[PDB]
Design a protein around this ligand. Structure first.
Ligand SMILES: Nc1ncnc2c1ncn2[C@@H]1O[C@H](COP(=O)(O)OP(=O)(O)O)[C@@H](O)[C@H]1O
Ligand SMILES: Nc1ncnc2c1ncn2[C@@H]1O[C@H](COP(=O)(O)OP(=O)(O)O)[C@@H](O)[C@H]1O
Ligand SMILES: Nc1ncnc2c1ncn2[C@@H]1O[C@H](COP(=O)(O)OP(=O)(O)O)[C@@H](O)[C@H]1O
Ligand SMILES: [Mg+2]
Ligand SMILES: [Mg+2]
Ligand SMILES: [Mg+2]
Lengths: 428, 425, 40, 43, 429
């Protein structure tokens, strides 16, 4: 069945393909070539796992199509889902709801997980009888007990309309009641059931259990929850506005106290900002200070620009980043692919897309990709597969590649054809 | 429909079984290579295997780029989602451009949800709370006695359900709706402010397997803000100004997980569709740079772009010129289908099809004259002259368009080139 | 009695399906998470 | 409503959801309940 | 705290008693003149005499400007409010830039409130009224309070009988009574009467410890901005305000003047003590002309904190102007209101000292030859780059089963990762 997630541009990548010594293996876990860059990404991944040093910034820089985002996806896959990995595009911070600095702060705080443990003492059981002073009788498969009821407790039992046969949980620390459902029985079967009705088995073991529960949240979620009375709604709608510095400072201090008490754990993650050259000078200046915080995640960036104009200024800088921020980060450089690496990337893409191709087809597709671009060849893989299926074939041949090459143009051929008829296109 | 639109004649791509474009079929004339490419694109979309692959329709104005996108939409069908948008629609004043693009991406993913509705419907003959609730429903096929969960009694009281009223009860959700009074009591009073509804015809218990198509964006906006809540804050939220909001990535991920769970259960089916972004040259550099990641996603649909610009400056950038007004980086992520200028014969065939679609009878001489005019100015101008020419023909008491009417209309209305020449003088 | 027991079986199947769907789904955050994440 | 998430924030808890998932009544128990279908003294 | 940041080794200005900077102390190396001037600035802050005095740290990148500011902050302690800001933060979407600046100014003025409360708390043991003939008439209400220390009887005013019945105080209930108002507050049944069989939570409380009568001192630290926010929007109007997004507001000068008056009244009454602090504005060159102009008036206020600016832009065009260049991206008018402290480039020896201190703080064992190689790399490239190589080289060494960084690990890490200049060279080619 077609699940929500389908074959995308990075579906074949399932990690960095490194060994225990971080030596890059050729054609491992979907990664081909980029040996030096993959080794550097492994070193950065070890830094992220260690977590000791906050605010380390890494810029993955290279030519278009050299696997920068592929390396980022490999890092995200190799890193466990427990550790946060916030992947955004540079253009996601330009919002009408909040300033750019607020958006970068929220991206920073979303990339730091905090794991909070909590112990509670609850009484869970099936209600046998309730008498309106008051008395309540509960039972499990192993025990039966009767309690005396206070004024607030009898009020809570009445308001929730707890009836005999229900399964309820009452927290001794707070005295609140929650109805988990009603136990099914010979007499409680009905022709229609209410929306809230849930059938549940009688609880096992002892009534008064001691719980240990661990909640995994992030600093941004804590900020939003503490932003206003119904702040957790903004965890859905995103209408968080600009969270005040008071709330953030009080949360940083409370989390520090929690970690000192052993209640919470901090899991520093990664903030990947692809296409980082969309950030403006204000964003870069904010990042220069934001990375100096001890609650800063490890920052990874990707760009393909050369000596280009910094957005928001008239200055030109390498990678479109001012040298203040470039001095604060390490640069990993990608390398253009060889013929062998191109062919192996095409083979892995065919294996993911479930396409069978003849060897001559592999040679011609590799030549096309070397001459035009790797992405164009990847697209022509599925194009030729479709054209072959329309032909009632079972293996993609060179003729199908020539067919799709004639049907779908690349940038160069399309540009040449546009220039040939430039009198018809607008605003040349 | 009833009103003739600029593409009402386009009913498909006109391909044969071998995937080759017929010269004139399904309202499309010429553009053989582009129709065959759009055929391969339709096969890609129907495959439901790939995500986030993108296509750029390139060529001069009036070369059928939008017509071809609508032909793809026709070939897919109504079940497959097809979200059209224009590049200038990203400049919302309520949400960021990337949010508008993400919303349109989610709209193009459909989710067909399959369910059996069970409903008990009939006239109420008895309502006695005992615990449990006993209700008696009557229909044209008989009377049935039902035992209801006591939680439905509150719903029955809220709906003010009494004996003799026609109501329905959902077996899965217990929702009760009082759909008026039974028409048998229409004579109980001569003047009552009540809505009488006929007694249901079928059985009291009705079963129907149904399907509903929803988009992931619909789930996103349903979970964006609480609805139907009886709490005072929910009532105020019902009252407040509805605004688009920058729905968070975490909610989208959770919705994806739940949809995946229900796809695994078998009660939902994914229907990936197409997002059509016309005039993609209008997007700014920020939108294109976000679209890089958006297309690289594994949840994205097939996105069809259309650009008519030449080597123009990318918007939101000073003097950086890229082909089609699209950065080369995004161009490397798309497949380019080239549309060509029409030959005079193809323009004549298009004019004929447009006239036939508008219901206009045109003589051979008028058709030849219109073809000559279109050759001299534009196809769209010749095609637009058909309706006024028919109007003048009907005013002159004629059911067919002659060359005199086309001459008169082309004298009354100028083309863009003629106005430009006049204003140059 | 075969029809009546078939109808009962169908009711039980629908009960099972609805109860499985209701009990299958966990909240994204929950009450306790919000309570424990709240500052004093 | 199977996709309604925000409605669960005021209705259930993650630990309560785990309890509900663990203690849901299986088919055989309903079949048995359909097939089969304490005086206190102060000592 | 536990995680290691770029400035986690800065523990203060390494100054002696005579105000001179040691060559290397408290994690700082060199910058003797700049540390001495920062010392005079720290004395200025601690003197509390002056308001609105501005100092500009100016110098090349990686010359310790932010390290010196955080060293000043460490010297001042945690009592003095030190508010870090970056110039990019003024561009808010909820409020005007001048409001952001004024809010950050008021965040750097601290106020310490001292509250002394007298309370009589304990478990109630009797509530006997004292009947009398009026010159049934009661002249006193005797309440007996029990704590773990002992029992006390209070001859309370008869009017307290209304509050006792309002609070439903009964024998065995734990209460506390404040000396000033004389109103009773009930806090639950004493836990000595709680059984394990009854279910209540809030209605039980342990017997108070300590003497029945207590004198409690509560000290709270606030900023003038905290008071501003509190008085600007107090917490059905509350329902609508909490449902809608509580955006920042452009707090009026009227409210700030009223709050200044209230704080002066508290300082006269002795309830409160002012702790004026420091606002640090890094990357101040991100401010626009309107912000700098506002800062002209803000620094002339008698209420303003001491502000520390940092810039490295050199002769650069002022943001929000066209072609108006200024020595630091700051208009010359503002530069006349600030003292400038220059920071100077480091020698290779100072770079080696900083690298060693960083390695110590990160917990990294570095060999002498490895330290020399990394220093020589840092004399090329940048200091920041050489520091950043420390932990990846330590990890590379740990992979190879070495407890200390060897020179080969530094060479390999340098071969893997490149600096800004090497990348510029690759881009040029
Ligand atoms: N190291 C790699 N191994 C395998 N495939 C790669 C690699 N790098 C790039 N690709 C392929 O090319 C595309 C990814 O290129 P990408 O990383 O987006 O380039 P850019 O650096 O411009 O972002 C994917 O379709 C993927 O199949
Ligand atoms: N291949 C075609 N066959 C038939 N009619 C066409 C064709 N291409 C365009 N038309 C008609 O001419 C009009 C202009 O074409 P259009 O699709 O708008 O071009 P573009 O979208 O590239 O500007 C269409 O609305 C349609 O009515
Ligand atoms: N004189 C010094 N002694 C010790 N550490 C220093 C010194 N100067 C800079 N550093 C450290 O080296 C790095 C330089 O960054 P920073 O001080 O922020 O420079 P900038 O002046 O560019 O803001 C910081 O980690 C800082 O703690
Ligand atoms: Mg990329
Ligand atoms: Mg069009
Ligand atoms: Mg600094």
């Amino acid at each position: 069945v077609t699940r929500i997630e389908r074959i995308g541009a990075h579906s074949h990548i399932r990690g960095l393909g490194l060994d225990d010594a971080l030596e890059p293996r050729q054609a491992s876990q979907g990664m081909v070539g980029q040996l030096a860059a993959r080794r550097a990404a492994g070193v950065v991944l070890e830094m992220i796992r260690e977590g000791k040093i906050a605010g380390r910034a890494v810029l993955i820089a290279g030519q278009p199509g050299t696997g920068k985002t592929a390396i980022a996806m490999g890092m995200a896959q190799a890193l466990g889902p427990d550790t946060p990995f916030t992947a955004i595009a540079g253009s996601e911070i330009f919002s009408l709801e909040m300033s750019k600095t607020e958006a970068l702060t929220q991206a920073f705080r979303r990339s730091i997980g905090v794991r909070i443990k909590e112990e509670t003492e609850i009484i869970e059981g099936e209600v046998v009888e309730i008498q309106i002073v008051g008395k309540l009788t509960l039972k499990t498969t192993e025990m039966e007990t009767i309690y005396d009821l206070g004024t607030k407790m009898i009020e809570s039992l009445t308001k929730d309309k707890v009836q005999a046969g229900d399964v309820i949980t009452i927290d001794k620390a707070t005295g609140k009641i929650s109805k988990l459902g009603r136990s099914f029985t010979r007499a409680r079967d009905y022709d229609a059931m209410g929306s809230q009705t849930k059938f549940v088995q009688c609880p096992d073991g002892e009534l008064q259990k001691r719980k240990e529960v661990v909640h995994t949240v992030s600093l941004h979620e804590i900020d939003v929850i503490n932003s206003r009375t119904q702040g957790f709604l903004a965890l859905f709608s995103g209408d968080t506005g600009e969270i005040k510095s008071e709330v953030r400072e009080q949360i940083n201090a409370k989390v520090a106290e929690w970690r000192e008490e052993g209640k919470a754990e901090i899991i520093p993650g990664v903030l990947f900002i692809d296409e980082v050259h969309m950030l403006d000078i204000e964003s870069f200046s904010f990042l220069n200070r934001a990375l100096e915080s001890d609650m800063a995640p490890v920052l990874i960036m990707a760009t393909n620009r050369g000596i280009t104009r910094i957005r928001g200024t008239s200055y030109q800088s390498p990678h479109g980043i001012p040298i203040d921020l470039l001095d604060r980060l390490l640069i990993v450089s990608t390398t253009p692919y060889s013929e062998k690496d191109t062919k192996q990337i095409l083979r892995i893409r065919c294996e993911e897309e479930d396409v069978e191709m003849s060897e001559d087809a592999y040679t011609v597709l590799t030549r096309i990709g070397l001459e035009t671009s790797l992405r164009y060849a990847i697209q022509l893989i599925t194009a030729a597969s479709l054209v072959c299926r329309k032909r009632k074939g079972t293996e993609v041949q060179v003729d199908d590649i020539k067919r799709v090459y004639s049907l779908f143009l690349d940038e160069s051929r399309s540009t040449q054809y546009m220039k040939e008829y430039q009198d018809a296109f607008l605003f040349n | 429909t009833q009103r003739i639109a600029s593409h009402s004649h386009v009913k498909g791509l006109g391909l044969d079984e071998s995937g080759l474009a017929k010269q004139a079929a399904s309202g499309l004339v010429g553009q053989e290579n582009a129709r065959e490419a759009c055929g391969v694109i339709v096969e890609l979309i129907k495959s439901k295997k790939m995500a986030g692959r993108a296509v750029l329709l390139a060529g001069p104005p009036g070369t059928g780029k939008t017509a071809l996108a609508l032909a793809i939409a026709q070939e897919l069908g109504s079940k497959v989602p097809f979200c059209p948008m224009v590049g200038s629609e990203v400049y919302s004043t309520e949400i960021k451009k990337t949010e508008v693009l993400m919303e349109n991406f989610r709209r193009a993913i459909g989710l067909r949800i399959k369910e059996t509705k069970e409903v008990y419907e009939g006239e109420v003959t008895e309502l006695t709370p005992c615990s449990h609730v006993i209700i008696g429903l009557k229909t044209a096929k008989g009377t049935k006695q039902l035992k209801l969960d006591p939680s439905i009694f509150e719903s029955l009281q809220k709906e003010r359900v009494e004996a003799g009223d026609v109501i329905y009860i959902e077996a899965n959700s217990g929702a009760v709706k009082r759909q008026g009074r039974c028409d048998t009591y229409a004579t109980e009073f001569d003047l009552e402010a009540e809505e009488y509804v006929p007694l249901p015809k079928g059985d009291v218990h009705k079963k129907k397997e149904i399907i509903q198509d929803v988009t992931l964006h619909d789930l996103d906006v349903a979970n964006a803000r609480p609805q139907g809540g009886q709490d005072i804050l929910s009532m105020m939220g019902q009252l407040m100004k509805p605004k688009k909001t920058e729905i968070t990535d975490k909610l989208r991920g959770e919705i994806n997980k739940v949809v995946n769970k229900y796809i695994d259960q078998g009660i939902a089916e994914l229907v990936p569709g197409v997002l059509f972004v016309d005039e993609v040259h209008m997007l700014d550099i920020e939108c294109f740079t976000y679209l890089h990641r958006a297309l690289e996603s594994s949840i994205a649909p097939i996105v069809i772009f259309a650009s008519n610009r030449g080597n123009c400056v990318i918007r939101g950038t000073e003097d950086i010129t890229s082909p089609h007004g699209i950065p080369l980086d995004l161009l490397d992520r798309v497949m380019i289908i080239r549309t060509m200028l029409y030959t005079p014969q193809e323009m004549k065939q298009i004019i004929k099809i447009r006239a036939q679609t508008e219901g206009i009878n045109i003589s051979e001489e008028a058709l030849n004259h219109l073809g000559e005019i279109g050759t001299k100015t534009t196809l769209r101008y010749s095609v637009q002259l058909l309706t006024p020419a028919n109007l003048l023909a009907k005013i002159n008491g004629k059911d067919s368009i002659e060359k005199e009417h086309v001459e008169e209309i082309s004298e009354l209305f100028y083309d863009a080139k003629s106005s430009a020449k006049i204003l140059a003088d | 009695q075969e029809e009546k027991t078939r109808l009962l079986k169908e009711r039980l199947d629908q009960i099972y399906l609805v109860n499985e769907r209701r009990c299958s789904q966990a909240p994204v955050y929950g009450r306790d998470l919000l309570r424990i994440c709240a500052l004093p | 409503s199977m996709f309604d998430l925000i409605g669960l924030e005021n209705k259930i808890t993650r630990h309560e959801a785990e309890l509900l998932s663990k203690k849901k009544i299986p088919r055989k128990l309903m079949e048995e309940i359909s097939t089969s279908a304490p005086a206190a003294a102060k000592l």
